[PDB]
Amino acid sequence: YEARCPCGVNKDDGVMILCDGCDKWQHAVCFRILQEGDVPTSHVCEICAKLKPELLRTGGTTDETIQNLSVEARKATCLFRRVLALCLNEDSVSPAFIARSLGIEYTVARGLFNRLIKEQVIKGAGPRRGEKLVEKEYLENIVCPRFFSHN
Ligand SMILES: [Zn+2]
Ligand SMILES: [Zn+2]
Fold first, then answer.
1. What is the Å distance from ligand 1's center to 138 Cα?
2. Measured in angstroms, how far is the CA atom of residue 86 from the centroid of ligand 1?
3. What is the rounded CA–CA span in Å between residue 34 and residue 14?
4. Nearest CA to 87 among 98, 73, 76, 99?
5. Keyword annotations for this protein (predicted)?
6. What CA–CA distance (Å, rounded) separates 70 from 88?
7. Angle between helices 95-102 and 71-88 (to 10 degrees)
8. Is 78 known as a binding-site position?
9. Cys-Cys link to 103, which of 9, 14, 69, 120 (CB 3.0-4.6 A)?
10. Which ligand is nearest to the CA of 44?
11. Given the DSSP bridges, would you call strands 92-93 and 122-125 parallel, antiparallel or unpaired?
């Protein structure tokens, strides 16, 4: 059993999806999948989509938004998706909590925290210094559909 995911953190968290091409697991949210019903019949990771494109013509589905990005741009997108999903299940966050939860370095977590402020997902002081409260309804009803809609 192996996790191999372009967020760069090769550890199970949340809903995991199996690539039909390499038999490694990715975080569903990294691949733009939040609801279990949006898990494809045959998931294809970003590596297999480029090594074996026939997988995509014979029933497989990749996340076309990250497939051809650079390593660094893809990692930043996937990690931000993970932090959005974390916020869906929490009342407040901080860089340190983000770092622990996602398995990443503090400085990277702080960048994700800062982007949450810009996307207006967090606002208002939490109980502890450095924490901000999640705008729960705004996240669920408005922000999340910007990133995770399948229509
Ligand atoms: Zn991931
Ligand atoms: Zn694969």
1. 24
2. 13
3. 10
4. 98
5. Chromosome, Meiosis, Metal-binding, Nucleus, Zinc, Zinc-finger
6. 27
7. 110
8. no
9. 9
10. 2
11. unpaired
- Cα 107 to Cα 17: distance, rounded to the nearest angstrom: 28
Q: How far apart are CA 93 and CA 104, in angstroms?
A: 15
Domain parsing of the chain, residue ranges: 71-148
Q: Is 87 annotated as a binding residue?
A: no
Paired with 61 in beta bridges are 43
Name the one residue in this structure whose structure tokens are 């953190």: 9
- Kindly give the distance from the C-alpha atom of residue 3 to the centroid of ligand 1, in angstroms, as a whole number: 9
* CA count, 13 A, side-chain hemisphere, 3: 17
Block residue for tokens 């967090």: 122
The token pair at 67 is 């497939």
Give the technique used to solve this structure: X-ray
Q: Which CATH architecture has domain 71-148?
A: Orthogonal Bundle (1.10)
Q: Is 48 annotated as a binding residue?
A: yes
SS3 string, 83-97, reads HHHHHHCCCEECHHH
CA distances, 73 to each of 6, 58, 69, 85, 151 (Å): 10, 28, 6, 19, 25
Question: Do 59 and 41 form a contact (C-beta atoms < 8 A)?
Answer: yes
Resolution, expressed in angstroms to one decimal: 1.5
How far apart are the CA of 140 and the centre of ligand 2, in A?
30
